[PDB]
Every structure is written in structure tokens, then in C-alpha cells.
mmCIF file of C-alpha atoms and ligand atoms in Angstrom:
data_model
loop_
_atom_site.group_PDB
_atom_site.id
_atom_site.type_symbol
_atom_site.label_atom_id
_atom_site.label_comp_id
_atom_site.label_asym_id
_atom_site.label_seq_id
_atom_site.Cartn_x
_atom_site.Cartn_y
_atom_site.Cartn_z
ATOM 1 C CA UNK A 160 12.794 50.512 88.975
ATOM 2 C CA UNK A 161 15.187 53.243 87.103
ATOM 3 C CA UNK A 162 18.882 53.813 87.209
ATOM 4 C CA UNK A 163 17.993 57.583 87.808
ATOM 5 C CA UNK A 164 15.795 57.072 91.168
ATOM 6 C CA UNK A 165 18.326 58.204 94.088
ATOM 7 C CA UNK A 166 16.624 58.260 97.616
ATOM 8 C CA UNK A 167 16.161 61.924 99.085
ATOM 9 C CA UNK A 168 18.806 61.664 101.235
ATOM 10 C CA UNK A 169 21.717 61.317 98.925
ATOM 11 C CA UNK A 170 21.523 64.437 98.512
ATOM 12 C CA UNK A 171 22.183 68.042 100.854
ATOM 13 C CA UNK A 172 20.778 71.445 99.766
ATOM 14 C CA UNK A 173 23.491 74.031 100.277
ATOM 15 C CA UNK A 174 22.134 77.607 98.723
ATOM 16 C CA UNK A 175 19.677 78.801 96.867
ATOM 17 C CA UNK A 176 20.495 80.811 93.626
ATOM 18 C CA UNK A 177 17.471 82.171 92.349
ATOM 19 C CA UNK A 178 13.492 81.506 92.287
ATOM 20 C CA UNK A 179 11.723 80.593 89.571
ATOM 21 C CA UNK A 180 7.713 80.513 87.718
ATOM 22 C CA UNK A 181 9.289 76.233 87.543
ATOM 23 C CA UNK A 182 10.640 75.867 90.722
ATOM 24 C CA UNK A 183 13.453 77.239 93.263
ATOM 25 C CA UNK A 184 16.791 75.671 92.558
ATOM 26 C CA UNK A 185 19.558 74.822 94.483
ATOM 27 C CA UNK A 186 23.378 74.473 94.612
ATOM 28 C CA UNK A 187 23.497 70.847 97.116
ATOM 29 C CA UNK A 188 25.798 68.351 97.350
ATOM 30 C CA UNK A 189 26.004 64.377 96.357
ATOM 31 C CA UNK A 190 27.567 63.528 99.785
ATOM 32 C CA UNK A 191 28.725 60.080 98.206
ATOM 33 C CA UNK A 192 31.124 61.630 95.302
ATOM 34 C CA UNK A 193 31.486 64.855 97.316
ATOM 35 C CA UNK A 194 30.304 66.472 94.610
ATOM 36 C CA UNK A 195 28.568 70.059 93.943
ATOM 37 C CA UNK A 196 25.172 69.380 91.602
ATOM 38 C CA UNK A 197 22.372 71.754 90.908
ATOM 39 C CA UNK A 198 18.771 70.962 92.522
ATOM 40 C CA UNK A 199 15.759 71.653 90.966
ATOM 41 C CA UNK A 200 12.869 71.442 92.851
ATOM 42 C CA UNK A 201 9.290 72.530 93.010
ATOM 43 C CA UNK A 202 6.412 72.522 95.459
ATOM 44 C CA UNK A 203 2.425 72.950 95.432
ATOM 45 C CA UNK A 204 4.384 75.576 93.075
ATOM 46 C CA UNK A 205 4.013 76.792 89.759
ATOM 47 C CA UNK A 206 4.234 73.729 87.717
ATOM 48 C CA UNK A 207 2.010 70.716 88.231
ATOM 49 C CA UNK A 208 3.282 67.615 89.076
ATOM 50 C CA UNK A 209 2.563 65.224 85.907
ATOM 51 C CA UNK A 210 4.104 68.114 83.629
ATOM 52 C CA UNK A 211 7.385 67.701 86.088
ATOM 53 C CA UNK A 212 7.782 64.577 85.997
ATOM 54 C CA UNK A 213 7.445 64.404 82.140
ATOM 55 C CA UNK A 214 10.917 67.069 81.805
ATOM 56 C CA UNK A 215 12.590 64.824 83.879
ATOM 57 C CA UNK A 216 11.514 61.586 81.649
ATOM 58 C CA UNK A 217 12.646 63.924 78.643
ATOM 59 C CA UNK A 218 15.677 64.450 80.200
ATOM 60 C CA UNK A 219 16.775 61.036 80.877
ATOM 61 C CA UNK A 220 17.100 60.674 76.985
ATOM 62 C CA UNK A 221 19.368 62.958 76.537
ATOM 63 C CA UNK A 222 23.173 63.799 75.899
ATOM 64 C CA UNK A 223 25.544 66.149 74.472
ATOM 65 C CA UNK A 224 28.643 67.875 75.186
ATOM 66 C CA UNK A 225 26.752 71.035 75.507
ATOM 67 C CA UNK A 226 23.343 69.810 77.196
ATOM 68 C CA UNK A 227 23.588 70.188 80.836
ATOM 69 C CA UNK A 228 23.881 66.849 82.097
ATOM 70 C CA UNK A 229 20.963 65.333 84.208
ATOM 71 C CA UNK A 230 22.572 63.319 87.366
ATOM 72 C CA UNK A 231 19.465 61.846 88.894
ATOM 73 C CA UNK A 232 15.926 61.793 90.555
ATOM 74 C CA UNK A 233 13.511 61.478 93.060
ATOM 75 C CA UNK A 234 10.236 60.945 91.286
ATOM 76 C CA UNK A 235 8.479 58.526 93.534
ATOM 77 C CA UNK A 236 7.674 60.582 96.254
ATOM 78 C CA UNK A 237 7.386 64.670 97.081
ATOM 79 C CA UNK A 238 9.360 66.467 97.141
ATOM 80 C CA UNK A 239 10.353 66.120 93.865
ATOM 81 C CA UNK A 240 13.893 66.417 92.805
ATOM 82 C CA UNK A 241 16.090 66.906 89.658
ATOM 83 C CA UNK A 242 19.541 66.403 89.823
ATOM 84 C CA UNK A 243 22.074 68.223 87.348
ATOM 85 C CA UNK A 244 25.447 69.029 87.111
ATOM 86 C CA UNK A 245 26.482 72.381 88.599
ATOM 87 C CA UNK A 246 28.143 75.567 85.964
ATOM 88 C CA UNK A 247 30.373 77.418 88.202
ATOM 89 C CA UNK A 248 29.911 80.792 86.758
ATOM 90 C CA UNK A 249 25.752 81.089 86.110
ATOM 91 C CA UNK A 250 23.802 81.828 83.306
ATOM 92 C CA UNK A 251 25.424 83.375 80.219
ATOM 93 C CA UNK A 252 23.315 86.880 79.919
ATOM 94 C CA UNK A 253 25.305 87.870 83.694
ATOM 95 C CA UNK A 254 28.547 86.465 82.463
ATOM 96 C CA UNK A 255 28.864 88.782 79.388
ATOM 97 C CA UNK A 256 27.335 91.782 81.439
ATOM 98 C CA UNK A 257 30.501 91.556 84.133
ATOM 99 C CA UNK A 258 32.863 89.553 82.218
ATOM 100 C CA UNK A 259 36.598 90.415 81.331
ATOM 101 C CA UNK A 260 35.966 91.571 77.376
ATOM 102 C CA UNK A 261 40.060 91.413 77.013
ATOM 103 C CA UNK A 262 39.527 87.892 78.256
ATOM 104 C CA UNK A 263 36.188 87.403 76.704
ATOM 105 C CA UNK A 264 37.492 88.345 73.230
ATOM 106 C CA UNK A 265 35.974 88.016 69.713
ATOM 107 C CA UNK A 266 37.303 84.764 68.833
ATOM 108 C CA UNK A 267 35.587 83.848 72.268
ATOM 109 C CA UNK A 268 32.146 85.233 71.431
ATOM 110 C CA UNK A 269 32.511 82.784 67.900
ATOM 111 C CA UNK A 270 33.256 79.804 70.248
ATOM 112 C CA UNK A 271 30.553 80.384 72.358
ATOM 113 C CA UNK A 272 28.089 80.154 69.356
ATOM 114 C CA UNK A 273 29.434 77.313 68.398
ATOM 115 C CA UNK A 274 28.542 75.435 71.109
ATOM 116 C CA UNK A 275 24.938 76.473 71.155
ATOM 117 C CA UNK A 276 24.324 75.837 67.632
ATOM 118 C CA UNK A 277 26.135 72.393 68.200
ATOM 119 C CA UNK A 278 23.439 72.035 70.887
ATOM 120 C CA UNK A 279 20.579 72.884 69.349
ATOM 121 C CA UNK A 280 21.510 70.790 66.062
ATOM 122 C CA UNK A 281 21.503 67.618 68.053
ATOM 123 C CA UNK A 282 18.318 68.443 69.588
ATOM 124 C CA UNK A 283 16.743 69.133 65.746
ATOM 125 C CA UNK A 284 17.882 65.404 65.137
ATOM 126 C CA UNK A 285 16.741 64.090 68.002
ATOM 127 C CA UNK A 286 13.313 65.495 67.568
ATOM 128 C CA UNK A 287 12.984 67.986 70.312
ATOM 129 C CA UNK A 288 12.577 72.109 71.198
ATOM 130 C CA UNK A 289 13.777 73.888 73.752
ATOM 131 C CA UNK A 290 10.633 75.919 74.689
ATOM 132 C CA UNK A 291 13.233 79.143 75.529
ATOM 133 C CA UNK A 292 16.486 79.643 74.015
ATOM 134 C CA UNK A 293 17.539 83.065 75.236
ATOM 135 C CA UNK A 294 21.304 83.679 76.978
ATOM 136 C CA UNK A 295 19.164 83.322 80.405
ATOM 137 C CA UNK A 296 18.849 79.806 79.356
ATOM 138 C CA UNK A 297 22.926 79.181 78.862
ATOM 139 C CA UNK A 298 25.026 78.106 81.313
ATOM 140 C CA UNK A 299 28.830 78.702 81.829
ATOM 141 C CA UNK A 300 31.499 76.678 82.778
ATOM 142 C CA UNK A 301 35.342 76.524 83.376
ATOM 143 C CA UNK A 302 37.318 78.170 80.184
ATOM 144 C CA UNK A 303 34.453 79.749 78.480
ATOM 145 C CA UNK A 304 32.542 76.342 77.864
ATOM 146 C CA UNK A 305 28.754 77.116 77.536
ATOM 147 C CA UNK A 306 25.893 74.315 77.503
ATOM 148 C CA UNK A 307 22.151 75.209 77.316
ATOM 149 C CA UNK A 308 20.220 74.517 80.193
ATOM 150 C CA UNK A 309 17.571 71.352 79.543
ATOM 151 C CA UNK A 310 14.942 71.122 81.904
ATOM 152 C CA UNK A 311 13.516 73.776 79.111
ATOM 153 C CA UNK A 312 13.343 70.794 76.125
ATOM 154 C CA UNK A 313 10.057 69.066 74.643
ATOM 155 C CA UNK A 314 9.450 66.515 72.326
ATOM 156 C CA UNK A 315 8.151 67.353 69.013
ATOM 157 C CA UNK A 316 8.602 65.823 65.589
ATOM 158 C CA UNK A 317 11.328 67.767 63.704
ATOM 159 C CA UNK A 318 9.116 69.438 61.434
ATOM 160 C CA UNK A 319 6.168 69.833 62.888
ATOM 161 C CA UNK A 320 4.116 72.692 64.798
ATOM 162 C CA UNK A 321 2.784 72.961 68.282
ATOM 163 C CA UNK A 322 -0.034 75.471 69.236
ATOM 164 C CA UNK A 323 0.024 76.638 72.898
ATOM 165 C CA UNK A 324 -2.626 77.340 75.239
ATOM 166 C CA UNK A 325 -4.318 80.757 74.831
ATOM 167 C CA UNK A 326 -3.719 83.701 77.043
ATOM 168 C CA UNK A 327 -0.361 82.402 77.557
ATOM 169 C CA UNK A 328 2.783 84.377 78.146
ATOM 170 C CA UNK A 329 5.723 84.221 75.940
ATOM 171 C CA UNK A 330 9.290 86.325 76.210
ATOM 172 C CA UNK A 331 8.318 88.497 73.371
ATOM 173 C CA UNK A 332 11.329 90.287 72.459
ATOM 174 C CA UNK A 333 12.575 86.141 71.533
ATOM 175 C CA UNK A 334 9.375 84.751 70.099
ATOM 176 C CA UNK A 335 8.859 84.210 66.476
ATOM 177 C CA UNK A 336 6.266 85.777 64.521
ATOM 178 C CA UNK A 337 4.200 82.816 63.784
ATOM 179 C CA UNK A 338 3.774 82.344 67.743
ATOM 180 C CA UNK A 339 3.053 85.883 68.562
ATOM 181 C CA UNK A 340 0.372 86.161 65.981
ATOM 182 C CA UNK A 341 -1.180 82.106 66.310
ATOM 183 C CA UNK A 342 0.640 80.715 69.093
ATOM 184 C CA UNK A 343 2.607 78.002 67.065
ATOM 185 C CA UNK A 344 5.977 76.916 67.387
ATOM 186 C CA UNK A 345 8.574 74.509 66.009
ATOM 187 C CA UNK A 346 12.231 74.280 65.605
ATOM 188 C CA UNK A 347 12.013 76.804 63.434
ATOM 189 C CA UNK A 348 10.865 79.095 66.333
ATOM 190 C CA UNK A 349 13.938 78.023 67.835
ATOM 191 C CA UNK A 350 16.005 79.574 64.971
ATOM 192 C CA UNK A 351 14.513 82.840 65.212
ATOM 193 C CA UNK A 352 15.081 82.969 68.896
ATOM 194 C CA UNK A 353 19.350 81.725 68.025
ATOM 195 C CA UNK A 354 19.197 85.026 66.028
ATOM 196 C CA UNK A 355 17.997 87.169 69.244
ATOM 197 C CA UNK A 356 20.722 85.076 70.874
ATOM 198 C CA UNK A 357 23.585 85.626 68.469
ATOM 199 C CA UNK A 358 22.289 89.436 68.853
ATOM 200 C CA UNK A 359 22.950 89.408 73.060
ATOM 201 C CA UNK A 360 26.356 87.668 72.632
ATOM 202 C CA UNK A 361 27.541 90.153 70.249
ATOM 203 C CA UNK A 362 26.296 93.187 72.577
ATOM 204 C CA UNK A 363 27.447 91.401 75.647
ATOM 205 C CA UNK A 364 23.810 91.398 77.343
ATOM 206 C CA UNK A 365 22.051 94.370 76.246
ATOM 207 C CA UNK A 366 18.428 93.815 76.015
ATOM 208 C CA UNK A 367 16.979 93.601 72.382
ATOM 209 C CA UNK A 368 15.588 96.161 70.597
ATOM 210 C CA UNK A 369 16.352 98.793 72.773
ATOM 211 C CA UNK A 370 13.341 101.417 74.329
ATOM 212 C CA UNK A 371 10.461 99.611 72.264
ATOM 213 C CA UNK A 372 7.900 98.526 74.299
ATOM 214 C CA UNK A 373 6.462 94.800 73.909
ATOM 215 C CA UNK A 374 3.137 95.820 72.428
ATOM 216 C CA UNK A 375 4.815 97.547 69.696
ATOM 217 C CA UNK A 376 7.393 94.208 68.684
ATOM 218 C CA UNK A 377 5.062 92.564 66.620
ATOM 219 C CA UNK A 378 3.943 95.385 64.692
ATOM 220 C CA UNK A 379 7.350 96.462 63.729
ATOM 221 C CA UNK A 380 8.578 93.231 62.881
ATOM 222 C CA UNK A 381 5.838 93.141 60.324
ATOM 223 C CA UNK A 382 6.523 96.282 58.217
ATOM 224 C CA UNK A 383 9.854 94.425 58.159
ATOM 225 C CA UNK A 384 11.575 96.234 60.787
ATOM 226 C CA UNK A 385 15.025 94.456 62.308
ATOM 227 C CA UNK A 386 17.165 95.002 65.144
ATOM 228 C CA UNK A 387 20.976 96.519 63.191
ATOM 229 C CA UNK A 388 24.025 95.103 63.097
ATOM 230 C CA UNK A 389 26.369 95.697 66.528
ATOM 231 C CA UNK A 390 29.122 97.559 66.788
ATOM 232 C CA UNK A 391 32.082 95.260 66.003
ATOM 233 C CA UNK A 392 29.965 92.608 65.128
ATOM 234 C CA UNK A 393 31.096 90.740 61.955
ATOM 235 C CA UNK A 394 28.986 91.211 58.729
ATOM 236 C CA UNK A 395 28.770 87.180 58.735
ATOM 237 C CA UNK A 396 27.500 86.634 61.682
ATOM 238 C CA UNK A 397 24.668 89.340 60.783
ATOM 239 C CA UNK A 398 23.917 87.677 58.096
ATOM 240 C CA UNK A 399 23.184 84.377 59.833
ATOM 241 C CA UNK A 400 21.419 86.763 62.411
ATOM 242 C CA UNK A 401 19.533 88.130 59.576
ATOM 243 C CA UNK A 402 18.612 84.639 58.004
ATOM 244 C CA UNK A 403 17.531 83.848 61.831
ATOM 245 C CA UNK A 404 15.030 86.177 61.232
ATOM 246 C CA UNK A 405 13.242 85.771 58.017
ATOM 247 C CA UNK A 406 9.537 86.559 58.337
ATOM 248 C CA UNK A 407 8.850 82.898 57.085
ATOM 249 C CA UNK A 408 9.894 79.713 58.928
ATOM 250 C CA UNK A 409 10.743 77.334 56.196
ATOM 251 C CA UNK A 410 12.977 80.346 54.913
ATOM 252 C CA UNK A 411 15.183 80.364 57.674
ATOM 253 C CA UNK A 412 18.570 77.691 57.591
ATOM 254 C CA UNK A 413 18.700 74.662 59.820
ATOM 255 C CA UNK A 414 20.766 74.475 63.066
ATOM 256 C CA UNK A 415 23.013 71.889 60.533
ATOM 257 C CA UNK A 416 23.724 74.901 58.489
ATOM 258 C CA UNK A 417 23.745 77.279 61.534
ATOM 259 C CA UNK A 418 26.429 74.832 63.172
ATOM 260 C CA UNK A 419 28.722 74.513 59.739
ATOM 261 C CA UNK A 420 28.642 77.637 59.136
ATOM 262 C CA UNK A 421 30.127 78.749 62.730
ATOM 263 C CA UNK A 422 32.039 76.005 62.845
ATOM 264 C CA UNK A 423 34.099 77.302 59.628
ATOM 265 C CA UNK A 424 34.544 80.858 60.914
ATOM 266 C CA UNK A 425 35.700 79.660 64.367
ATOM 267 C CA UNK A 426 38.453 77.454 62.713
ATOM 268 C CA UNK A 427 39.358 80.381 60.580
ATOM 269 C CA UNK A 428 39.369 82.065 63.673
ATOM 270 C CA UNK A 429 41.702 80.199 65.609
ATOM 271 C CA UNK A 430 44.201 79.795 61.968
ATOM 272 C CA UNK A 431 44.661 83.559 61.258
ATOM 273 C CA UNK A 432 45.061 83.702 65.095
ATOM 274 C CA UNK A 433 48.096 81.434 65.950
ATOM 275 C CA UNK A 434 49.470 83.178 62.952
ATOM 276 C CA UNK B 232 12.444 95.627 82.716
ATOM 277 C CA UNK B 233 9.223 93.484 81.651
ATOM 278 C CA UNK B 234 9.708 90.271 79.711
ATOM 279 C CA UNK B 235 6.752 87.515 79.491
ATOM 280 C CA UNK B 236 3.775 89.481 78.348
ATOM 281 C CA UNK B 237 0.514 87.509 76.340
ATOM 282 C CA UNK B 238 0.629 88.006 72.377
ATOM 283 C CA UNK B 239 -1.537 91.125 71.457
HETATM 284 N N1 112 C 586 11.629 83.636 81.524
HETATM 285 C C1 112 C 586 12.113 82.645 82.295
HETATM 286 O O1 112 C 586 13.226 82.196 81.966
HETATM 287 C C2 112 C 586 11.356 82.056 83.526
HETATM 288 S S1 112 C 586 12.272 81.271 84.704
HETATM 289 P P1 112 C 586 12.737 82.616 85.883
HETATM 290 O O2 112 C 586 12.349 82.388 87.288
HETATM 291 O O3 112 C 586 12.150 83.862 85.343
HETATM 292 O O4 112 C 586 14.319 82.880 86.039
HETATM 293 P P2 112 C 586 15.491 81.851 86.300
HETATM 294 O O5 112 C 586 16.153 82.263 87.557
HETATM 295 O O6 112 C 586 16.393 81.793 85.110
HETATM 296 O O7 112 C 586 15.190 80.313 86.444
HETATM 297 P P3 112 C 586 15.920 78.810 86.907
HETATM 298 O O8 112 C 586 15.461 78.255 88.185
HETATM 299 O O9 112 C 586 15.857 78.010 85.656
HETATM 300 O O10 112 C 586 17.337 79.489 87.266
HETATM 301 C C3 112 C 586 17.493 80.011 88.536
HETATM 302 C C4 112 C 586 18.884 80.593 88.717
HETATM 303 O O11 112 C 586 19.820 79.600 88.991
HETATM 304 C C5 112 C 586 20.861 79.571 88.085
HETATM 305 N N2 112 C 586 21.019 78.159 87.612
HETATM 306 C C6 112 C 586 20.125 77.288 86.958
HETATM 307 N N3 112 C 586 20.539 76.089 86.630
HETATM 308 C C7 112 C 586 21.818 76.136 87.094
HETATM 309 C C8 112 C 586 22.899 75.195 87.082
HETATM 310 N N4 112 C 586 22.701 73.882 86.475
HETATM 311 N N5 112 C 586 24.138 75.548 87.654
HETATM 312 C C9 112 C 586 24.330 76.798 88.227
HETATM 313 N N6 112 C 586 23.382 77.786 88.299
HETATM 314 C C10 112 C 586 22.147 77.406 87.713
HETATM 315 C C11 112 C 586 20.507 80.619 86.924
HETATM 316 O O12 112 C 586 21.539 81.505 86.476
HETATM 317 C C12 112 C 586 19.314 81.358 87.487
HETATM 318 O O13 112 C 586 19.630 82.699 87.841
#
């Protein structure tokens, strides 16, 4: 028994947006409410079963304002299903890329960090880490509201460090130095990768550091090298960005600093703005 | 582009 176990068929797959190294998903519909949800499935795919069905335990426990929403499943038999609510206009990288920027203004860019860092705060509390936080991960809704996608969180102990398989593959131009170099992470990985994030908002999706090729990242970042500030982008924000980045993990803030401190310049945003 | 690539 579970209050999240719907049977297969209350649910109809309508498109397919995009393929993925987890699992295909798909725009369907919950015939009962009529409504449009987002399908996540996966075959003899990628991912193996037990792993699967562990997300969608993890994602059971969860909720926030800006933490896509799980709906449902359909664990007991293949195939396996996870039901979430559906963000009209896609991931956040493609948004900024073809977006309005009249529309999608600077106080707009400050809102939409907000919401992340409000994210990712709870998620520090609630002892977990979202395994990649990168603008590919961010979802958009109606009016500019942004929520990061969770089928990508895992539980770990606020605090303490995980050490991944070897061999494996990581989004470099996001990935601390500490996992680069020993394959460790912690919410303090998570930070770093916030910076890289802060750094795609305020560029409106152009791909970090520009022309240097992913062998070379590491190296660079060690003789203290740093992507520099946008053009337009405010000197706080940088800063953040910068303290994001600090060669050592325990150096960089907390998303409960990261969250404050947007929180302020978003208010003081909106003030000098009605005025 | 290129983006997952193992550590070097
Ligand atoms: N490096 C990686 O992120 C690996 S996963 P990927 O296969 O390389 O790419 P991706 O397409 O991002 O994976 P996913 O299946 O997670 O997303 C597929 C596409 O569908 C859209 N999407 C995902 N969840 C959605 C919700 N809840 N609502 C609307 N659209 C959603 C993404 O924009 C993505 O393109």
C-alpha cells in the first residue's frame, strides 16, 4: 500500500520532449483531473531499476514551492512511471537563450535566483543534494516562476561527503574541484555549481568559460583562474558568484546565506523600482 | 558542444 501507487492506466502519454542517459519523458495526461503532468519513464534503459525506484522514494518526501512537485507512481510493476507536474515553458538554459530580455529584465534575472537558492536551502536542511544543479536542471513556469527539477536529489547528511564510482562522468564545466580531482561531493559541491548557475542567468545561456576545452578546466581553476564578471552583471551578485567559487568547500557561504542575501537585493529591487 | 567527460 502507498498513497502514490496510481494504476498504469490513469494515465495517457501525449508527446515526447526529449531523451535522456535516465529515461525518455513525456508530456501525458491524468484523464481523471484532465490534467497535463510530465512522465518519466525508463526501460531495460540507462538506469537500473532498484536505483529508480529509490528517486522516486526520495521524492515522495519532498516539498517546496520551488521543487517540482511529484504527482504519483507506478512502482509495482514495469513499466515504471513517475508522475510530476508539467512547466509550460521547459528548462531554464532554452528560456533565457529565446526569451524576451525587455520582458526578462534585471529585476527578473534577481527573482529567478531567488527561487533557486530558496530551493536549494530547503534541501541543505532537509539533508539532501541535487546530484546536478545547472540551468538544464530548472524548470519554468507561468510569470517567470522557476523550480528545480527533483528526480536529480539524493540523500546525504548535510555535512558530509560522498565519493562516486571511478571512471565516472561528471558535467565538468559545473563540478567542483574536490570532485574533479577525488570524486567527492557534498552540498558544498552544490554551491560551487549555484555560482556556474548564477554565471548562465546573468549571460542568458552562454556556455561557461568560453573556447576552453574540458581537459584544460581543472588545471586553470587551480592556478586560480575564474570565469569574469558579465556584462551588466551587478558587482554583488559577482561577489556571491565569486564566494561560490572558493577553491575550499568549507570557505564557501551556505544556501541560508546565499538565499538572505538575494532575498535583500530582490526586495531592494522591487522598492527603488515602484519608485 | 561536449559536456559529461571523466575527471582527468
Ligand atoms: N547532463 C544531463 O543533464 C543528462 S540528462 P540529458 O538526457 O542529457 O538531457 P535532458 O533532456 O535534460 O533530460 P530529462 O529527461 O531530465 O529532460 C528531458 C527534456 O524534457 C524537458 N522536461 C523535463 N522535466 C520536465 C517537466 N517536469 N515539464 C516540462 N518539460 C520537462 C526538459 O527541458 C528536457 O529537455
Amino acid at each position: 500500500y502507498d498513497k502514490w501507487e496510481m494504476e498504469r492506466t490513469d494515465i495517457t502519454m501525449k508527446h515526447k520532449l526529449g531523451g535522456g542517459q535516465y529515461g525518455e519523458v513525456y508530456e501525458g495526461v491524468w484523464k481523471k483531473y484532465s490534467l497535463t503532468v510530465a512522465v518519466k519513464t525508463l526501460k531495460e534503459d540507462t538506469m537500473e531499476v532498484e536505483e529508480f525506484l529509490k528517486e522516486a522514494a526520495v521524492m515522495k518526501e519532498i516539498k517546496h514551492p520551488n521543487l517540482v512537485q511529484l504527482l504519483g507512481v507506478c512502482t509495482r510493476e514495469p513499466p515504471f512511471y513517475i508522475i510530476t507536474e508539467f512547466m509550460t515553458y521547459g528548462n531554464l538554459l532554452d528560456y533565457l537563450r529565446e526569451c524576451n530580455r525587455q520582458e526578462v529584465n534585471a529585476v527578473v534575472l534577481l527573482y529567478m535566483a531567488t527561487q533557486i537558492s530558496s530551493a536549494m536551502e530547503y534541501l541543505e536542511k532537509k539533508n539532501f543534494i541535487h546530484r546536478d544543479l545547472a540551468a538544464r536542471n530548472c524548470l519554468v513556469g507561468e510569470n517567470h516562476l522557476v523550480k528545480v527539477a527533483d528526480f536529480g536529489l539524493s540523500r546525504l547528511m548535510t555535512g558530509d561527503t560522498y565519493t562516486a564510482p571511478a571512471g565516472a562522468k561528471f558535467p565538468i564545466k559545473w563540478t567542483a574541484p574536490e570532485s574533479l580531482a577525488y570524486n567527492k561531493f557534498s552540498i558544498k559541491s552544490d554551491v560551487w555549481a549555484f555560482g556556474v548557475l548564477l554565471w548562465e542567468i546573468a549571460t542568458y545561456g552562454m556556455s561557461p568559460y568560453p573556447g576552453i576545452d574540458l581537459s584544460q578546466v581543472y588545471e586553470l581553476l587551480e592556478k586560480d583562474y575564474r570565469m569574469e564578471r558579465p556584462e551588466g552583471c551587478p558587482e554583488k551578485v559577482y561577489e556571491l558568484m565569486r564566494a561560490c567559487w572558493q577553491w575550499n568547500p568549507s570557505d564557501r557561504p551556505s544556501f541560508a546565506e546565499i538565499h538572505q542575501a538575494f532575498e535583500t537585493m530582490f526586495q531592494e529591487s522591487s522598492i527603488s523600482d515602484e519608485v | 558542444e561536449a559536456i559529461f567527460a571523466a575527471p582527468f
